[PDB]
Amino acid sequence: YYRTVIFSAMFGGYSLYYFNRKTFSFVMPSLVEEIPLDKDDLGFITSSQSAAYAISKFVSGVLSDQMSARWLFSSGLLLVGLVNIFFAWSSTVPVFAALWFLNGLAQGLGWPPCGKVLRKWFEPSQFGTWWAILSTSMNLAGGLGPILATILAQSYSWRSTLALSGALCVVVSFLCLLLIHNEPADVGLRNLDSTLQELLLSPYLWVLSTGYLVVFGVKTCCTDWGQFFLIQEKGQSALVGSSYMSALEVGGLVGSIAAGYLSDNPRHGLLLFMMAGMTVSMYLFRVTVTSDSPKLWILVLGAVFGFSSYGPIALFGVIANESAPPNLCGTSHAIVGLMANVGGFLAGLPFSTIAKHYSWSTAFWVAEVICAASTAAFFLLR
Ligand SMILES: O=C(/C=C(/c1ccccc1)n1cnc2ncccc21)O[C@@H]1C[C@](OC[C@@H]2C[C@@H]2c2ccc(Cl)cc2)(C(=O)O)C[C@@H](O)[C@H]1O
C-alpha cells in the first residue's frame, strides 16, 4: 500500500521531471522552424541545462542530509512547472537559456530526494531493483515524449505542449505535496534500519567516472541531437526523428531492465560488450541511414543504441554503489553524477559547436570517435 503509493506518485512524478528535462529536446523542430536559432544557441541552452543540473545534483546530495526529501521534490516539481510555463511565454534565446538554467537547478534538486525516499522505504538489499524500476521512468517519459510532442506540435503548437506539461507538473506538484512521505516514522509505520581524499585519488572512481562521462555524453548527444541530425542532414521528417528518440528510449527501457538480469570483475565484461555495441550502433547510424533507408531500420538502430546506452548507465550505477565505502557512499555517487553531467555539458555546447563548424556528420564522427577511443582504452585497461 504505502510502498505502492510511494513509488507510483514518484514514478509518475519523476516522469514529469524527465518529460520536462528533455522538453526542449522534444519540441526542438518546431522551435527551430518557427524562429531561427544558432546551433551554438541550442547547444548553449542544453549546456546551461547540463551545468545547472551538475551543480544542483552535487549540492542536493548534501541537501538530502540537511533537508527533507518530500519538500524538495514537491518544490522542485512546482519550480519545473513554473519554469516551463514561463518558457512557453518567452521567445528569445537569452531568456530561454536563463529559464532553462533554472530548469537545470530544479531538476537537480529532485532526484536525490527520490534517492532519500526510496532509501528510507525499502530494504537495502532491495535498493537495486527499485532503483532500476525508478530509472526506467526516464525511458518511459522519453518514450512517450517525442511522439506526443510531434503529434501535438503539428496540430496545435510547441507553446501549447509546453503549457500543458507545465500545468500538469504544477498539478502533480500539489499532489506530491500530499502523496509521498519522507519518513515512515512520521506516520508511524514501524521504521526499518582523510579517506575522502583517498576516494578522490582512487583510480577506479576516475575510470568509472570518465566512462560514465563518455556514456552519458554520447547518450545526451544522440538523444538531444539525433532527431535534429535526421531532420537537417539525412532528409528524414520530424516524425521519423521523434520516433528515433522514442525507439532510443524504448531500447533504453529494455537495457536498464535487462542490465539487472544480465548482471546477476564479470560485470565489467558485460559493460564493455555493451559499450562496444553502443559504438557499433552509432557507427551504423552515422553511415547506413539514408533518405531511401526505411523507418524500421532506424527504429531498430535506436533500440540497439538504447539497449547499449542506458544499459551501461545502469551498470555504472550498480558498480558505483559496489565500489563505494558504506560510510560515505553518497559522496561517490555525487562525484560520479558530477562527471556524468560534465559529460552532458560537453555533449551540449561544444558538440553543437563542432556540428555547425564542420558538419553534423563530422559531429557524430567526433562523438563516435570519442566513444570508440573510450571503448578501446577500456579494452586495454582490463
Ligand atoms: O544511485 C545509484 C545506485 C544505487 C544502487 C543501489 C543498490 C544496487 C546497485 C546500485 N544507489 C545509491 N544510493 C541509492 N539510494 C536509493 C536507491 C538506490 C541507490 O547510481 C547513481 C545514479 C545516478 O545518481 C543518482 C544520485 C545518487 C542519487 C539517487 C537518486 C535516485 C535513486 Cl532511486 C538512488 C540515488 C543517477 O541516476 O543520475 C548517477 C550516478 O550518481 C550513479 O552512481
Domain segments of the chain as ranges: 1-193, 194-382
128 lines ligand 1 (CB under 6 A): yes
| Secondary structure, 3-state, 134-184 | HHHHHHHHHHHHHHHHHHHHCCCCCCHHHHHHHHHHHHHHHHHCCCCCCCH
Declared resolution, Å: 3.4
Q: Which residue has the cell 541550442?
A: 42
CATH code for 194-382? Answer: 1.20.1250.20
- Minimal CA–CA distance to 284: which of 297, 272, 294, 295? 297
How far away, in angstroms, is 56 Cα from ligand 1 center? 15
Helices and strands, counts by H and E, the chain:
18, 0
- Minimal CA–CA distance to 334: which of 123, 32, 64? 64
254-292 b/e with 16+ CB inside 10 Å = b? bbbbebbeebeeeeeebbbebbbbbbbbbbbbbeebeee
The pick from 114, 131, 338 for probing ligand 1's pocket by mutation, whose C-beta has the most ligand atoms within 8 angstroms, reads 131
Four-residue CA torsion sign, 194, 195, 196, 201? positive
143 lines ligand 1 (CB under 6 A): no
Which atom from ligand 1 is nearest to the alpha carbon of 124?
7
131 lines ligand 1 (CB under 6 A): yes
Cα 99 from Cα 102, distance rounded (Å)? 5
DSSP state string for 53-87: HHHHHHHHHHHHHHS-HHHHHHHHHHHHHHHHHHH
How far away, in angstroms, is 295 Cα from ligand 1 center? 35
Method for this entry:
cryo-EM
Q: Which three cell numbers stand for residue 298?
A: 532506424
CATH code for 1-193? Answer: 1.20.1250.20
The count of other CB atoms within 10 Å of the CB of residue 161 is 23
Cα 56 from Cα 63, distance rounded (Å)? 10
How far away, in angstroms, is 123 Cα from ligand 1 center? 14
Which atom from ligand 1 is nearest to the alpha carbon of 118?
16
* 16, 330, 376 from 90: Cα distances, Å: 21, 37, 44
- The answer to whether domain 1-193 and domain 194-382 are alike in fold is yes
Q: What is the DSSP letter of 288?
A: S
What length does the chain have? 382
200-219 b/e with 16+ CB inside 10 Å = b? eeeeebeebbbbbbbbbbbb
Cα 350 from Cα 212, distance rounded (Å)? 18
Q: Which three cell numbers stand for residue 136?
A: 526506467
